[PDB]
UniProtKB/Swiss-Prot annotation:
InterPro entries: Kinase-like_dom_sf, MAP_kinase, MAP_kinase_CS, MAPK14, MAPK_p38-like, Prot_kinase_dom, Protein_kinase_ATP_BS. The lineage of its organism: Eukaryota, Metazoa, Chordata, Craniata, Vertebrata. Belongs to the protein kinase superfamily. CMGC Ser/Thr protein kinase family. MAP kinase subfamily. It comes from Homo sapiens. This is Mitogen-activated protein kinase 14. Changing P314R: In a lung adenocarcinoma sample; somatic mutation.
Length: 344
């Protein structure tokens, strides 16, 4: 039951995949392919140098554990994972397979004000996957239009959840990479939690409604100023919670500003959209609406269905606090590769 693999050069590299996968074409490097066993269009990712350091070995493991866990319509999961290796000692490459969606939320929306129902449907799907992700005590933490995979039927899957990898230069300047980040994680105010993802959803939703980036900061400080101008400066209760004395000290230097009226910012928008944005874009993370609570909000009355909004089984991330050697991460990775059961 080891399938027959065939070799092929794509993306300056030798892809060796089971015969079931045909018509590979570039799109880790990623190829679109046709899965002859399932009839599905699939995306196949070949990891580069998954075991070159302790840090990458753990990342590879992390990515696989994460992708193996997610079984939800609005979250990218695994149809397949394989390696051409026949044993651990020759194990070297990992290939991950999921549904081909073919575009991201930008390749559809950037500089476009969309209809209220399209916004309803896209945001409902994001919140629906987020409830599922968050129920597993997993934090996406870098949610943004380019991490939302979307096909022609406006069906949406969340990508790249749970990886905490972005370098400082990637976050610097007038860059999309920081514009959807919650202030408390942007400026490292505190050991953050899952409510940071709801901040990102509000940023995305606002942009779908107006056709414009909500907080297009030119640097971290410019972006903070844009945020506080909309949502107000921190009150006393929130200040305490900023465990970062340096951060706290800077915020207290700022002229106090009241929260703006959202109905005058998002002129013409559905009042239920505005109301929901007000519950999403709250400075104090403790008081933000959660994914579960938002799904029950009147804005989504057309799509909401409490019997089809599943939660996840618990996700054992005890491994995150574990120090291991490269080859122990590799062995754990191999185990997960070889224990994989495909879905129905
Ligand atoms: C979002 C997107 C836009 C254009 C082309 C492909 C894709 C795309 C991917 N990059 C990916 C993708 O990056 C990916 C993630 C996990 C995995 F196991 C395998 C994968 F190929 C998945 C699906 N699609 O549709």
């Amino acid at each position: 039951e080891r399938p027959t693999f065939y070799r092929q050069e794509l993306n300056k590299t030798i892809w060796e995949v089971p015969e079931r996968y045909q018509n590979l074409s570039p799109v880790g490097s990623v190829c679109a392919a046709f899965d002859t066993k399932t009839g599905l269009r699939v995306a196949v990712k070949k990891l580069s140098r998954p075991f070159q350091s302790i840090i990458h070995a753990k990342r590879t493991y992390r990515e696989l554990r994460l992708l193996k866990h997610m079984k939800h319509e609005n979250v990218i999961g695994l149809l397949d994972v394989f390696t051409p290796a026949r044993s651990l000692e020759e194990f070297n490459d990992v290939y991950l397979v999921t549904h081909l969606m073919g575009a991201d939320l930008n390749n559809i929306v950037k500089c476009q004000k969309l209809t209220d129902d399209h916004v309803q449907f896209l945001i409902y799907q994001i919140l629906r996957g987020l409830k599922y992700i968050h129920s597993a005590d997993i934090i996406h933490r870098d949610l943004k239009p380019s991490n939302l995979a979307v096909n022609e039927d406006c069906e949406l899957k969340i990508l790249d959840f749970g990886l905490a990898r972005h370098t400082d230069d990637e976050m610097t300047g007038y860059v999309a990479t920081r514009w959807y980040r919650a202030p408390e994680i942007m400026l490292n105010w505190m050991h953050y939690n899952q409510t940071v993802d709801i901040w990102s959803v509000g940023c995305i939703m606002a942009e779908l409604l107006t056709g414009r980036t909500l907080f297009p900061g030119t640097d971290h400080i410019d972006q903070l100023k844009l945020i506080l101008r909309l949502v107000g400066t921190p009150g006393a209760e929130l200040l305490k919670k900023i465990s970062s004395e340096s951060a706290r000290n800077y915020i207290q230097s700022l002229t106090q500003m009241p929260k703006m009226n959202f109905a005058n910012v998002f002129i013409g928008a559905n009042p239920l959209a505005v109301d929901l944005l007000e519950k999403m874009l709250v400075l104090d993370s403790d008081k933000r609406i959660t994914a579960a609570q938002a799904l029950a909000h009147a804005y989504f009355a057309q799509y909401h269905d409490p019997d089809d909004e599943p939660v996840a089984d618990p996700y054992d991330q005890s491994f995150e606090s574990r120090d291991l050697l490269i080859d122990e991460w590799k062995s754990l990775t191999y185990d997960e590769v070889i224990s994989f059961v495909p879905p129905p």
